[PDB]
Amino acid sequence: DLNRQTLDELESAPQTTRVRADLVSIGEKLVFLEALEKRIYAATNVPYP
Amino acid sequence: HQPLIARDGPHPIEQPTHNYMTKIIDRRALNAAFSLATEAIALLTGEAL
Numbered sequence: 001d002l003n004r005q006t007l008d009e010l011e012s013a014p015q016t017t018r019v020r021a022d023l024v025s026i027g028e029k030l031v032f033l034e035a036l037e038k039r040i041y042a043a044t045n046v047p048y049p
Numbered sequence: 050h051q052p053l054i055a056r057d058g059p060h061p062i063e064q065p066t067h068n069y070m071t072k073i074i075d076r077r078a079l080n081a082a083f084s085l086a087t088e089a090i091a092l093l094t095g096e097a098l
Contacts, residue, residue, distance in 0.1 A: 045063070046054050 024033040041048050051066045091097040 040054065043051055044054055046056070 022033045024031045037048050051068070053063060053065055056062065088097070
């Protein structure tokens with residue numbers, strides 16, 4: 001066959017938990033929208049890249 | 050207490066910093082008056098009864 005069973009599709013579906021995070025729809029696909037100067041770079045002296 | 054991040058070269062390697070602070074309590078007060086009258090003092094005591 002050409003369309004084989006792919007090696008990845010034999011693996012287990014891993015265990016999942018719940019995370020609070022912002023989700024935005026643009027076009028036809030969803031997006032994680034996120035700002036990163038409060039979770040990370042809060043009061044540590046490293047420049048925001 | 051400050052957290053850290055982990056950098057790569059050629060940046061400096063940082064250490065866990067700490068901060069320690071004490072503040073001095075300022076002091077303020079109040080004022081309020083009451084003034085009575087002379088020939089009403091005898092009325093409270095009883096000299097002019």
